[PDB]
Design a protein around this ligand. Structure first.
Ligand code: SOA
Ligand code: CA
Ligand code: CA
Ligand code: CU1
Lengths: 14, 298
């Protein structure tokens, strides 16, 4: 629905 | 924290192939490409000659670096790293953290390069697998200790393209030519079930499958590979020497480029195992599907 995510980042969870 | 050891050219070059200086057509024109990935435009790029590893750096090779230096990886300093949901063994404690839009990624405390699925796993049966849970920082450290460096995105793509002009994959345009699998990606229904039809539902050894025309293995699939470049979607759309002759990517950014796709990639979701594909991750992040190979100057 947006852009697929293959690189999970430490910042993404904050 | 460690002094850089003295190494001979032939020692650095062991396990590397000499890419000769030349031009190649970089980028992609696939109509289905996510515009935010900046896979285009296709451009001709000239590169100075360089060395690149046949293989992604392996567990055995990373353990030597750790043993020679005592390096502590970002995943150990942090206490956790990203494990795919299907590989967390039951009972393993997990953080409730949710990666937005990617609930299949689990923050597992004590997951790191020597224990890739968390407390109680080991790499004793994966010595020739790519090392994972290595951040961009961890990779630079190994590379520098080894007398090497991360490839630029253009070096990575030139080498992964294996002397083919604008093929879809490192070996050609067919995903499974003659019906044979050529890389370790996902088959089945992502992220619910991986049928393992290519032989692996996790990392494969770094020498798995046939190499590309330049002798590189597993540039497509297996593990994402850190590159030197700062990430941008559009710096390389400018036409200038800085963007077309030995391009280093933008001077600044917040995430670093990753190339190649991994064992989780699949056409129905990301479709990012094509050789023009690209994404990024912040430089102290780490996950079970991300490693690196090194480049060097001759
Ligand atoms: C949303 O646009 C989306 C979600 C999953 C897979 C592909 C795409 N395009
Ligand atoms: Ca696979
Ligand atoms: Ca790869
Ligand atoms: Cu992917």
């Amino acid at each position: 629905a947006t852009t697929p995510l293959c690189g999970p980042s430490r910042a993404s969870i904050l | 924290d460690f002094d850089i050891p003295r190494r001979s050219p032939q020692e650095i070059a062991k396990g590397m192939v000499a890419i000769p200086g030349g031009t190649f057509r970089m980028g992609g024109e696939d109509p289905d490409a996510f515009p935010e990935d900046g896979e285009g435009p296709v451009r001709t790029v000239r590169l100075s000659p360089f060395l690149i590893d046949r293989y992604a750096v392996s567990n055995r090779q990373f353990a030597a670096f750790v043993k020679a230096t005592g390096y502590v990886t970002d995943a150990e300093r942090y206490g956790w790293s990203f494990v795919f949901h299907a590989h967390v063994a039951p009972g393993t404690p997990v953080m409730d953290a949710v990666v937005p839009e990617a609930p299949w990624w689990v923050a597992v405390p004590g997951a790191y390069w020597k224990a890739p699925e968390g407390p109680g796993s080991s790499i004793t049966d994966r010595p020739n697998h790519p090392v994972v849970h290595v951040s961009w920082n961890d990779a630079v450290a190994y590379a520098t200790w080894a007398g090497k460096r991360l490839p630029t995105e253009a070096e990575w793509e030139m080498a992964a393209r294996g002397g083919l002009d604008q093929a879809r994959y490192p070996w050609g345009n067919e995903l499974t030519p003659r019906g044979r699998h050529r890389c370790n990606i996902w088959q089945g229904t992502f992220p619910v079930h991986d049928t393992g039809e290519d032989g692996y539902t996790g990392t494969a050894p770094v020498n798995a499958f046939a190499p590309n025309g330049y002798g590189l293995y597993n540039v497509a699939g297996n593990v994402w590979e850190w590159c030197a470049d700062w990430w941008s979607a559009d710096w390389h759309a400018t036409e200038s020497p800085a963007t077309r002759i030995d391009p280093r990517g933008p001077e600044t950014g917040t995430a670093r480029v990753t190339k190649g796709g991994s064992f989780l990639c699949h056409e129905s979701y990301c479709n990012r195992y094509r050789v023009a594909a690209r994404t990024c991750n912040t430089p102290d992040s780490s996950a079970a599907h991300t490693g690196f190979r090194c480049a060097a100057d001759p």
